[PDB]
């Protein structure tokens, strides 16, 4: 059972460090309310967060809309940003490298 | 001038460096840089590694 | 000192538009958050607008879809475009300088922690009567 | 929102005696991660109306008197003064910092008793 827990827990760390650390994503999130039709249940869990994105070339940056969980942001008391990411005040955030299961 | 937590903000940092540990440097609104970064990676050593 | 000159106004109709600005002064209008504030006579102060660093802005509740706040920041001048005006909107509108930060292409406009959030940096004012 | 709640709206004060004018957030104003409450106190004058007089707590602006330093916690603040001067004469206002709507008090006018 030992074992088996480290190596489970090393393969993921060798599945998951070749992949995107998402530094960009350590920013101010512009965060609204979803304008979609929100079941009674759902209101405010999911938020439209605006965010401006690095790109390929690195003096342009990218107006970004996404949507985020409520449990995956924090709020703060900014002025012109209301929320971040829980873990960027903890480690990088590091993302899983698509096309694996 | 310290980046912080979020790229988007910054922060003033104070701080006691021995004369050792910075050079001279020519600018508007500095007057010394620490003595490695004109040559070479400076890495923190860890707090709990004794 | 570090003082900015508000210049436009006059007396319109209901429904007229009208372009206010700001002229910068001594830097204050280059690394630096802008607000419109109304000083209605007779009334205490009251906040209309605020633009930050990266063109975002905001408006309270009664003002939003009406006025539009701008900055260029090549001419050094702050914009504020009026429509849909009403006799309550009778005041004295003028500039305010909010915090401050700077411009370095590790990520444009930035703000520090604990900095400065007041208003400073106040004008003279424009009376803008419907 | 904040609302602000100034809680004198008329005080005349002698200027032998010393004044005290203080007002209230219905919210905290405090900035846990930065450790700064941000609370702004305004006056007003016949002549140059709009005008910074303190910043925060105990931080006055460029150009104020020392007679001007404030007290307070992240709720209710307040200004005393030991002595209203003639050209301290006017009206005060609250401002918080922490939200961008920015919302003021009622002002305090200040007379000659």
């Known amino acids: 059972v030992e074992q088996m827990h480290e190596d489970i827990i090393s393969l993921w760390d060798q599945s998951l460090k070749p992949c995107v650390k998402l530094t960009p994503l350590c920013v101010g999130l512009q965060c609204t309310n979803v304008t979609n039709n929100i079941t009674d249940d759902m209101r405010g869990e999911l938020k439209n967060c605006s965010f401006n994105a690095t790109t390929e070339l690195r003096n342009k940056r990218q107006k970004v809309y996404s949507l985020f969980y409520r449990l995956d942001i924090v709020p703060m008391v900014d002025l012109w940003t209301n929320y971040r990411l829980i873990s960027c005040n903890t480690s990088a955030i590091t993302q899983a490298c698509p096309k694996v299961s | 001038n310290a980046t912080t937590e979020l790229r988007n903000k910054r922060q003033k940092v104070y701080s006691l460096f021995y004369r050792l540990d910075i050079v001279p440097m020519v600018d508007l609104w500095t007057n010394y840089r620490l003595i490695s970064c004109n040559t070479s990676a400076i890495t923190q050593a860890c707090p709990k590694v004794s | 000192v570090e003082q900015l000159v508000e210049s436009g106004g006059g007396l319109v109709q209901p429904g007229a538009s009208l372009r206010l600005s700001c002229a910068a002064s001594?830097?204050?209008?280059?690394?630096?958050?802008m607000h419109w504030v109304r000083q209605v006579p007779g009334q205490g102060l009251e906040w209309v607008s605020a633009?930050?660093?990266?063109?975002?802005?905001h408006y309270p509740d009664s003002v939003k879809g009406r006025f539009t706040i701008s900055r260029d920041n090549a001419k050094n001048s702050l914009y504020l475009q009026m429509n849909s005006l009403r006799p309550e909107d009778t005041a004295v509108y003028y500039c305010?300088?909010?915090?401050?930060?700077?411009?370095?292409?590790?990520?444009?406009?930035?703000?520090?922690?604990?900095?400065?959030?007041?208003?400073?940096?106040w004008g003279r004012g424009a009376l803008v009567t419907v | 929102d904040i609302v602000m709640t100034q809680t004198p709206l008329s005080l005349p004060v002698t200027p032998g005696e010393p004044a005290s004018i203080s007002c209230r957030s219905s919210?905290?104003?405090?900035?846990?991660?930065?450790?700064?409450?941000?609370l702004d106190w305004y006056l007003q004058r016949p002549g140059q109306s709009p005008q910074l007089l303190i910043y925060?707590?105990?931080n006055r602006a460029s150009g104020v008197p020392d007679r001007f330093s404030g007290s307070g916690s992240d709720t209710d603040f307040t200004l005393k003064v030991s002595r209203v001067e003639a050209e301290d004469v006017g009206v005060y206002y609250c401002?918080?910092?922490?939200?961008?709507?920015?919302?003021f008090g009622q002002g305090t006018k200040v007379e000659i008793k």
């Open positions: 305010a300088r909010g915090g401050r930060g700077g411009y370095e292409d590790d990520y444009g406009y930035f703000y520090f922690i604990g900095g400065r959030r007041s208003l400073d940096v």
């Open positions: 001594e830097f204050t209008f280059s690394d630096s958050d």
């Open positions: 633009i930050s660093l990266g063109g975002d802005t």
């Open positions: 919210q905290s104003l405090l900035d846990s991660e930065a450790g700064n409450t941000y």
């Open positions: 925060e707590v105990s």
């Open positions: 401002m918080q910092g922490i939200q961008l709507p920015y919302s």
